[PDB]
PDB file of C-alpha atoms in Angstrom:
ATOM      1  CA  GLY B   1     -14.528 -11.008   4.132  1.00 14.55           C
ATOM      2  CA  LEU B   2     -11.734 -12.923   5.863  1.00 12.88           C
ATOM      3  CA  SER B   3     -12.163 -15.561   8.446  1.00 12.48           C
ATOM      4  CA  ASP B   4     -10.735 -15.143  11.976  1.00 14.11           C
ATOM      5  CA  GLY B   5      -7.819 -17.489  10.985  1.00 12.19           C
ATOM      6  CA  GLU B   6      -7.079 -15.395   7.899  1.00  9.83           C
ATOM      7  CA  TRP B   7      -7.055 -12.123   9.854  1.00  6.99           C
ATOM      8  CA  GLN B   8      -4.679 -13.744  12.331  1.00  5.52           C
ATOM      9  CA  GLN B   9      -2.292 -14.641   9.484  1.00  5.39           C
ATOM     10  CA  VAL B  10      -2.566 -11.087   8.075  1.00  4.49           C
ATOM     11  CA  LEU B  11      -1.661  -9.516  11.390  1.00  2.81           C
ATOM     12  CA  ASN B  12       1.113 -12.025  12.022  1.00  2.31           C
ATOM     13  CA  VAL B  13       2.661 -11.102   8.689  1.00  2.00           C
ATOM     14  CA  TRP B  14       2.146  -7.412   9.534  1.00  3.59           C
ATOM     15  CA  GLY B  15       4.369  -7.966  12.578  1.00  3.20           C
ATOM     16  CA  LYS B  16       7.234  -8.482  10.086  1.00  2.00           C
ATOM     17  CA  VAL B  17       6.537  -5.149   8.515  1.00  2.00           C
ATOM     18  CA  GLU B  18       6.327  -3.357  11.941  1.00  2.00           C
ATOM     19  CA  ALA B  19       9.886  -4.479  12.833  1.00  3.27           C
ATOM     20  CA  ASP B  20      11.048  -2.116  10.123  1.00  4.27           C
ATOM     21  CA  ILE B  21       8.170   0.011   8.841  1.00  4.81           C
ATOM     22  CA  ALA B  22      10.192   2.729   7.137  1.00  5.29           C
ATOM     23  CA  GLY B  23      12.324   0.134   5.354  1.00  9.66           C
ATOM     24  CA  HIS B  24       9.339  -1.901   4.174  1.00  9.33           C
ATOM     25  CA  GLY B  25       7.548   1.290   3.154  1.00  9.98           C
ATOM     26  CA  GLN B  26      10.642   2.543   1.151  1.00  9.76           C
ATOM     27  CA  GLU B  27      11.020  -0.766  -0.651  1.00  8.09           C
ATOM     28  CA  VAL B  28       7.300  -1.038  -1.457  1.00 10.42           C
ATOM     29  CA  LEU B  29       7.282   2.457  -2.879  1.00 12.98           C
ATOM     30  CA  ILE B  30      10.453   1.955  -4.820  1.00 12.29           C
ATOM     31  CA  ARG B  31       8.949  -1.243  -6.300  1.00  9.15           C
ATOM     32  CA  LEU B  32       5.850   0.812  -7.233  1.00  9.32           C
ATOM     33  CA  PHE B  33       7.788   3.629  -8.826  1.00  9.10           C
ATOM     34  CA  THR B  34      10.239   1.541 -10.720  1.00  8.80           C
ATOM     35  CA  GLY B  35       7.649  -0.990 -11.980  1.00  6.96           C
ATOM     36  CA  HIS B  36       5.127   1.740 -12.848  1.00  8.14           C
ATOM     37  CA  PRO B  37       6.813   5.079 -13.513  1.00 11.55           C
ATOM     38  CA  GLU B  38       3.460   6.833 -14.121  1.00 12.35           C
ATOM     39  CA  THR B  39       2.836   6.486 -10.370  1.00 12.41           C
ATOM     40  CA  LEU B  40       5.838   8.665  -9.497  1.00 11.67           C
ATOM     41  CA  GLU B  41       4.442  11.586 -11.518  1.00 10.68           C
ATOM     42  CA  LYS B  42       1.583  11.763  -9.034  1.00  9.72           C
ATOM     43  CA  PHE B  43       4.066  12.708  -6.234  1.00  6.00           C
ATOM     44  CA  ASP B  44       5.240  16.316  -6.662  1.00  3.64           C
ATOM     45  CA  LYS B  45       7.692  15.753  -3.937  1.00  4.65           C
ATOM     46  CA  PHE B  46       9.249  12.511  -5.420  1.00  4.04           C
ATOM     47  CA  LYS B  47       9.146  13.477  -9.091  1.00  5.76           C
ATOM     48  CA  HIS B  48      12.760  14.810  -8.822  1.00  4.88           C
ATOM     49  CA  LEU B  49      13.956  11.179  -8.079  1.00  7.21           C
ATOM     50  CA  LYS B  50      15.516  10.073 -11.325  1.00  8.50           C
ATOM     51  CA  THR B  51      17.288   6.822 -10.385  1.00  6.82           C
ATOM     52  CA  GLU B  52      16.699   4.042  -7.944  1.00  5.18           C
ATOM     53  CA  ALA B  53      19.864   5.167  -6.103  1.00  3.09           C
ATOM     54  CA  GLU B  54      18.320   8.580  -5.556  1.00  2.58           C
ATOM     55  CA  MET B  55      15.127   6.799  -4.323  1.00  5.00           C
ATOM     56  CA  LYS B  56      17.041   4.639  -1.886  1.00  8.37           C
ATOM     57  CA  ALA B  57      18.970   7.689  -0.605  1.00  7.77           C
ATOM     58  CA  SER B  58      15.813   9.806   0.009  1.00 12.06           C
ATOM     59  CA  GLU B  59      15.049  10.151   3.685  1.00  8.66           C
ATOM     60  CA  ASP B  60      11.819  11.836   2.808  1.00 10.78           C
ATOM     61  CA  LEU B  61      10.773   8.726   0.799  1.00 15.09           C
ATOM     62  CA  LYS B  62      11.358   6.561   3.886  1.00 13.08           C
ATOM     63  CA  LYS B  63       9.344   9.051   5.954  1.00 14.27           C
ATOM     64  CA  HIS B  64       6.440   8.777   3.436  1.00 15.03           C
ATOM     65  CA  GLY B  65       6.801   4.986   3.591  1.00 16.24           C
ATOM     66  CA  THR B  66       6.305   5.234   7.332  1.00 16.38           C
ATOM     67  CA  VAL B  67       3.172   7.375   6.934  1.00 19.09           C
ATOM     68  CA  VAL B  68       1.642   5.134   4.199  1.00 21.54           C
ATOM     69  CA  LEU B  69       2.220   1.861   6.042  1.00 20.57           C
ATOM     70  CA  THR B  70       1.192   3.254   9.364  1.00 21.86           C
ATOM     71  CA  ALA B  71      -2.186   4.148   7.783  1.00 19.32           C
ATOM     72  CA  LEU B  72      -2.449   0.736   6.161  1.00 20.31           C
ATOM     73  CA  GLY B  73      -1.485  -1.081   9.339  1.00 19.51           C
ATOM     74  CA  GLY B  74      -4.111   0.711  11.412  1.00 20.86           C
ATOM     75  CA  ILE B  75      -6.709  -0.197   8.796  1.00 18.40           C
ATOM     76  CA  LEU B  76      -5.674  -3.833   8.792  1.00 19.23           C
ATOM     77  CA  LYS B  77      -5.937  -4.024  12.553  1.00 19.79           C
ATOM     78  CA  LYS B  78      -9.627  -3.117  12.201  1.00 16.69           C
ATOM     79  CA  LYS B  79     -10.105  -6.516  10.473  1.00 15.80           C
ATOM     80  CA  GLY B  80     -12.509  -5.046   7.874  1.00 14.19           C
ATOM     81  CA  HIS B  81     -14.358  -2.650  10.319  1.00 12.76           C
ATOM     82  CA  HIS B  82     -12.575   0.252   8.783  1.00 13.99           C
ATOM     83  CA  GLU B  83     -15.144   2.592   7.291  1.00 15.28           C
ATOM     84  CA  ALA B  84     -14.170   5.646   9.429  1.00 16.10           C
ATOM     85  CA  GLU B  85     -10.486   5.173   8.487  1.00 18.32           C
ATOM     86  CA  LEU B  86     -10.911   4.141   4.915  1.00 19.65           C
ATOM     87  CA  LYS B  87     -13.518   6.611   3.666  1.00 19.20           C
ATOM     88  CA  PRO B  88     -11.287   9.728   4.171  1.00 18.94           C
ATOM     89  CA  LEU B  89      -8.324   7.934   2.751  1.00 20.32           C
ATOM     90  CA  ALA B  90     -10.267   7.107  -0.396  1.00 21.14           C
ATOM     91  CA  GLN B  91     -11.691  10.573  -0.690  1.00 21.11           C
ATOM     92  CA  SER B  92      -8.292  12.213  -0.276  1.00 22.79           C
ATOM     93  CA  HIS B  93      -6.784  10.002  -2.920  1.00 23.80           C
ATOM     94  CA  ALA B  94      -9.581  10.571  -5.450  1.00 20.15           C
ATOM     95  CA  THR B  95     -10.118  14.278  -4.984  1.00 20.53           C
ATOM     96  CA  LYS B  96      -6.651  15.649  -4.029  1.00 20.45           C
ATOM     97  CA  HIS B  97      -4.078  13.076  -5.179  1.00 15.77           C
ATOM     98  CA  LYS B  98      -5.900  11.836  -8.274  1.00 14.03           C
ATOM     99  CA  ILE B  99      -4.802   8.171  -7.792  1.00 12.22           C
ATOM    100  CA  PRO B 100      -6.508   5.690 -10.136  1.00 10.41           C
ATOM    101  CA  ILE B 101      -7.612   2.476  -8.450  1.00  9.83           C
ATOM    102  CA  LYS B 102      -5.172   0.539 -10.655  1.00  9.37           C
ATOM    103  CA  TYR B 103      -2.340   2.057  -8.546  1.00  9.32           C
ATOM    104  CA  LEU B 104      -3.757   0.272  -5.521  1.00 13.60           C
ATOM    105  CA  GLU B 105      -3.606  -3.008  -7.464  1.00 13.18           C
ATOM    106  CA  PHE B 106       0.029  -2.129  -8.325  1.00 11.76           C
ATOM    107  CA  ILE B 107       1.019  -1.439  -4.715  1.00  9.16           C
ATOM    108  CA  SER B 108      -0.788  -4.615  -3.548  1.00  8.83           C
ATOM    109  CA  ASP B 109       1.392  -6.654  -5.955  1.00  8.71           C
ATOM    110  CA  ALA B 110       4.434  -4.695  -4.698  1.00  9.72           C
ATOM    111  CA  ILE B 111       3.653  -5.575  -1.030  1.00 12.69           C
ATOM    112  CA  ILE B 112       3.477  -9.259  -1.836  1.00  9.05           C
ATOM    113  CA  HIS B 113       6.735  -9.047  -3.770  1.00 11.44           C
ATOM    114  CA  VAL B 114       8.562  -7.120  -1.060  1.00 12.39           C
ATOM    115  CA  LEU B 115       7.382  -9.510   1.645  1.00 13.01           C
ATOM    116  CA  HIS B 116       8.877 -12.485  -0.238  1.00 16.64           C
ATOM    117  CA  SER B 117      12.066 -10.557  -0.992  1.00 11.09           C
ATOM    118  CA  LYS B 118      12.606  -9.552   2.646  1.00 13.22           C
ATOM    119  CA  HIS B 119      11.273 -12.768   4.195  1.00 12.28           C
ATOM    120  CA  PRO B 120      12.107 -15.570   1.784  1.00 13.59           C
ATOM    121  CA  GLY B 121      10.715 -18.869   2.864  1.00 15.26           C
ATOM    122  CA  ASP B 122       8.943 -17.213   5.773  1.00 13.20           C
ATOM    123  CA  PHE B 123       5.807 -16.004   3.886  1.00 17.53           C
ATOM    124  CA  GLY B 124       4.037 -19.251   3.173  1.00 16.09           C
ATOM    125  CA  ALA B 125       1.162 -20.050   0.884  1.00 16.56           C
ATOM    126  CA  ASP B 126      -1.494 -19.632   3.604  1.00 16.16           C
ATOM    127  CA  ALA B 127      -0.094 -16.328   4.718  1.00 13.61           C
ATOM    128  CA  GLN B 128       0.129 -14.973   1.165  1.00 13.98           C
ATOM    129  CA  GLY B 129      -3.487 -16.025   0.554  1.00 14.31           C
ATOM    130  CA  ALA B 130      -4.662 -14.176   3.683  1.00 16.19           C
ATOM    131  CA  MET B 131      -2.678 -11.059   2.989  1.00 16.09           C
ATOM    132  CA  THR B 132      -3.956 -11.013  -0.616  1.00 19.94           C
ATOM    133  CA  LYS B 133      -7.547 -11.138   0.704  1.00 20.70           C
ATOM    134  CA  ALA B 134      -6.898  -8.222   3.100  1.00 18.63           C
ATOM    135  CA  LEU B 135      -5.379  -6.089   0.322  1.00 19.91           C
ATOM    136  CA  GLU B 136      -8.212  -6.944  -2.059  1.00 21.35           C
ATOM    137  CA  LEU B 137     -10.766  -5.953   0.643  1.00 22.80           C
ATOM    138  CA  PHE B 138      -8.903  -2.603   1.173  1.00 20.90           C
ATOM    139  CA  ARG B 139      -8.829  -1.759  -2.517  1.00 18.66           C
ATOM    140  CA  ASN B 140     -12.361  -2.940  -3.131  1.00 18.58           C
ATOM    141  CA  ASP B 141     -13.696  -0.700  -0.360  1.00 20.22           C
ATOM    142  CA  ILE B 142     -11.717   2.155  -1.718  1.00 16.22           C
ATOM    143  CA  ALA B 143     -13.150   1.349  -5.273  1.00 16.09           C
ATOM    144  CA  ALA B 144     -16.701   1.662  -3.818  1.00 16.81           C
ATOM    145  CA  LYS B 145     -15.890   5.135  -2.497  1.00 21.47           C
ATOM    146  CA  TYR B 146     -14.381   6.137  -5.867  1.00 22.75           C
ATOM    147  CA  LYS B 147     -17.602   4.984  -7.560  1.00 25.49           C
ATOM    148  CA  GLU B 148     -19.613   7.225  -5.241  1.00 26.81           C
ATOM    149  CA  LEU B 149     -17.445  10.166  -6.448  1.00 26.49           C
ATOM    150  CA  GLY B 150     -17.505   9.082 -10.080  1.00 30.72           C
ATOM    151  CA  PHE B 151     -13.708   9.053  -9.930  1.00 30.59           C
ATOM    152  CA  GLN B 152     -11.753   7.232 -12.609  1.00 31.27           C
ATOM    153  CA  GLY B 153      -8.362   9.010 -12.715  1.00 33.15           C
TER     154      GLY B 153
END
């Protein structure tokens, strides 16, 4: 788990995201889709986006960014006591959306990148360590629910 000081760094960093949740969410998803184009094929409603300009110009992609980060932010604020929130999220992603756990590693990397890009010099080594722990905890709990389902991809 994370210590109290680590959770405090995670939620301090999350305050940066909440100042502009749709814009963080857009950029994180665009980083995901452009770095890993197989991820976009999972999204019937984003599969039409052929260029990064089209991605940036999609209001619906910003709206999804809002939904995705709002879910993540509520989970983070549980400081690891997140079973009731996380289990349905994992089950939805395995059974309906068919999202391999590797995509959660991809978006975790994208969050760290986007945080440095939007907050350069204001996301220090301690804060990156804490946020990395929180994202590992989230994906590892999701991975345990996928194992229950026997879900691979």
